[PDB]
């Protein structure tokens, strides 16, 4: 455009998916213990 630019995000969608999968795995394998230590 006329001096307009869009900046890409820092974290990609794959990293967010990995974080979500790790959260789900921790929840289904340890319950609430990983949340408190």
């Amino acid at each position: 455009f006329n001096g307009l630019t869009v900046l890409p995000p820092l974290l990609t969608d794959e990293m967010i998916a990995q974080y979500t999968s790790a959260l789900l795995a921790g929840t289904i394998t340890s319950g609430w213990t990983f949340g408190a230590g």
Binding site: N2, G3, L4, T5, V6, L7, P8, P9, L10, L11, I16, Q18, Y19, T20, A22, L23, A25, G26, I28, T29, S30, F34
Partner: protein, 237 residues
């Protein structure tokens, strides 16, 4: 010498012998006197307001309704009979279904005494819908829900005997897009005289760039504080 426009009616004001015209708190003219009758006449602005259109959807029908916000329908009929109304379209001149509401006058819908759930909000507790009744647009008063009565007593109690599992969803936004502005190509665009003239305005460009940079930096920490909570990557067996 005092020019204007409005409706002239008789009022009950009591002007002093040396008074000519009065003003209200906002310093607007609201009363004048006849130079040949010396009577008191009040001035009121002529009717005006917005127009709203109601449609059940172009994929279902082409019938619509018109709503004149904040006006009595008698003045609307008087203006339709003459040529004083500003909108030139009067296709609903033959429609006898005229109803008056607290939000205005509705033309093109019939009012019913029944009550249903609100589909299209109109105002003042009135909503409209498209029913088969031969299909047409109807108007009604919205209902809050079905009534219920509890069997209260001095020695009564209810205990459940079964249960069920339910799953619900919830959606929440986290961040938005990041944008940057050059502040020079947008205003001048390869023009030396324009740049020399803009150099005399100060540093608004710096403030704008700083605000945009701050927004762009905050957009990343918004996601960082939400998703980056755990420190280890767990795996399933």
């Amino acid at each position: 010498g005092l020019t204007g426009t409005g409706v002239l009616t008789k009022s009950n004001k009591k002007f002093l012998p040396f008074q000519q015209f009065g003003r209200d708190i906002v310093d607007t003219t609201d009363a004048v006197r006849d130079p040949q009758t010396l009577e008191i006449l009040d001035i009121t602005p002529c009717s005006f307001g917005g127009v709203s259109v109601i449609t059940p959807g172009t994929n279902t029908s082409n019938q619509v309704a018109v709503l004149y916000q904040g006006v009595n329908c008698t003045e609307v009929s008087v203006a339709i009979h003459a040529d004083q109304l500003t909108p030139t379209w009067r296709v609903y001149s033959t429609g006898s279904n005229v109803f008056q509401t607290r939000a205005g006058c509705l033309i093109g819908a019939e009012y019913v005494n029944n009550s249903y759930e609100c589909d299209i909000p109109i105002g003042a507790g009135v909503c409209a819908s498209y029913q088969t009744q031969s299909q047409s647009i109807i108007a009604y008063t919205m209902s809050l829900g079905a009534e219920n009565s509890v069997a209260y007593s001095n020695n009564s109690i209810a205990i459940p005997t079964n249960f069920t599992i339910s799953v619900t969803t919830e959606i929440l936004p986290v961040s938005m897009t990041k944008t940057s502005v050059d502040c020079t190509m947008y205003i001048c665009g390869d023009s030396t005289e324009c740049s020399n003239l803009l150099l005399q305005y100060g540093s608004f460009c710096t403030q704008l760039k700083r605000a945009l940079t701050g927004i762009a930096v905050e957009q990343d920490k918004n996601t960082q504080e939400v998703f980056a909570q755990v420190k280890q990557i767990y795996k399933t067996p």
